Design an enzyme around this catalytic site. Sequence first.
Site, short mmCIF file in Angstrom:
data_model
loop_
_atom_site.label_atom_id
_atom_site.label_comp_id
_atom_site.label_asym_id
_atom_site.label_seq_id
_atom_site.Cartn_x
_atom_site.Cartn_y
_atom_site.Cartn_z
CG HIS A 1 -3.25 -14.49 1.91
ND1 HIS A 1 -2.54 -14.63 0.73
CD2 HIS A 1 -3.71 -15.73 2.21
CE1 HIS A 1 -2.57 -15.89 0.35
NE2 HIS A 1 -3.27 -16.58 1.23
CB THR B 1 -0.94 -0.01 1.21
OG1 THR B 1 -1.80 -1.16 1.13
CG2 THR B 1 -1.80 1.26 1.25
#
Length: 384
Positions: free
Chosen positions: A77, A18
Site C-alpha cells: 500500500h 501481482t
Amino acid sequence: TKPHVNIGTIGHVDHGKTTLTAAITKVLAEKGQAEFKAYDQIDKAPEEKERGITISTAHVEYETENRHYAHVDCPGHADYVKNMITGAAQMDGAILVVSAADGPMPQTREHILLARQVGVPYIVVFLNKVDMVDDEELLELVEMEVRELLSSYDFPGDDIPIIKGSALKALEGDEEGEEAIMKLMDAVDSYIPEPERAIDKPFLMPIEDVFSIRGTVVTGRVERGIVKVGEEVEIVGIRDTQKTTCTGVEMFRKLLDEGQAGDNVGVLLRGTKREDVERGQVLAKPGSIKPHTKFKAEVYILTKEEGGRHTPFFNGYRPQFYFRTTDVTGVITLPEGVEMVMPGDNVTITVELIAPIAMEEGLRFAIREGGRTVGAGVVSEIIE
Ligand SMILES: Nc1nc2c(ncn2[C@@H]2O[C@H](COP(=O)(O)OP(=O)(O)O)[C@@H](O)[C@H]2O)c(=O)[nH]1
Ligand SMILES: [Mg+2]
C-alpha cells in the site's frame, strides 16, 4: 506505430494484483505480443530511491493488437500512495483488482480515493477469485457494491467495465480464465483513452531566470504546448496577470521560430520590464490558467528515513510550498476530524499561500522546511 498508454494494478493487498499482472503478460505472450513475466519476477519488485523517497515498483510492458502499454504493480500500500502522489509512475488509467470472495477492503477504498485526488482519468475493474464463489447472486452483489464505491468518489460506477475472472486459473492455462484476461484487455483498449499529447495542450512555460540585455528575456523549459514568434502570452502569477507578445525564441547560438513542449529556451518579451518578471511566474496561453492562493491537495509526508520530519505537525503548520521554481509560504488547515499528521502519512489538506501562483488541479508541488523537502503533494481542488 501502436499508441502508448501507462496503466497499473491497484487494490487491496492479497486480492491478486501481482497474479493478474503475470497472467496478462502470459496470455498476451501466448499471442506473440509480450514477454511472459512469472509471478515471482514481478512480486519481487526492485527498490528505486528517487529524492530520498524509496519505492518498490515492478515495470512490465506488453501490447494488445491496438496499443502498447507500460504497466506498474507495487508490493505494498505505501508504495501506491507514494507513486500516485509524487508521480513517479503516471497512470492514464488503472486496473482495480477486487477479490470477489472478500469484496472491497480499506485499501480498495483508499486507492479509489487517491485515484480521484491525483487525477487518474478512468478505472476498469477485474473482479478476481470468482473460483472461490459458487453463488451467482453473491457475485452480482459484490459487483454492485464496487460500483457504489466507485460512484461515491465521483467515478462513473454505472459505466465502468467490470470483468469477472480468476487470475490464478488463467495462469494455470485454464481456458475460461484466459478468456477473462482478454475481456479485460479488450476493455482497457476500449475504455481508457489515449493521453493527450503535451504539444497539443495550451502553452505553459515556468520561468526560471530573467535577463535584460533586445530587452527582457526569460528562460525555462516549455512544459506543454507551443509558443511561436509573434504570439501573445500572459505572465502568471504572484502579481497581477499581464499580457505581451513573444518576439523571439532561442537556444545556444541558435535562433528559433517556435518553442515546443520539452524545449529549454529563452523567450524574448516585448516591452516587458525586467522588474515586473520573476522566477516563480509562468508564461502561458492567455486565459489558459489563473493565479490562486488557496486550494486543497492530497499530500504524502516523508518519513524520517526519507529525510523528512520526525515529529507530527498540527493545524496551522506554516511551511514553504515549492511550485515549479520557488518557495511560497502557506498555512495548512487539516480535515474536519484530523488532529495531527505523522511522518509517513497521507492526508487531504487545505492551504492558503501568502502570494498567488498559477495553479490548476493536478499541479504537483513539494512541501519544504528549512530548505529541506518534508512532503509531496498534488493540487486536487481550487478554492476562490
Ligand atoms: N483462488 C485464487 N487465488 C488467487 C487468485 N489470484 C491470486 N490468488 C492468490 O492470492 C494470494 C495473493 O495474490 P497476489 O497477486 O500476490 O495479491 P497482491 O497483494 O494484490 O499482489 C496468492 O497466494 C495468490 O495465489 C485467484 O484468481 N484465485
Ligand atoms: Mg502484489
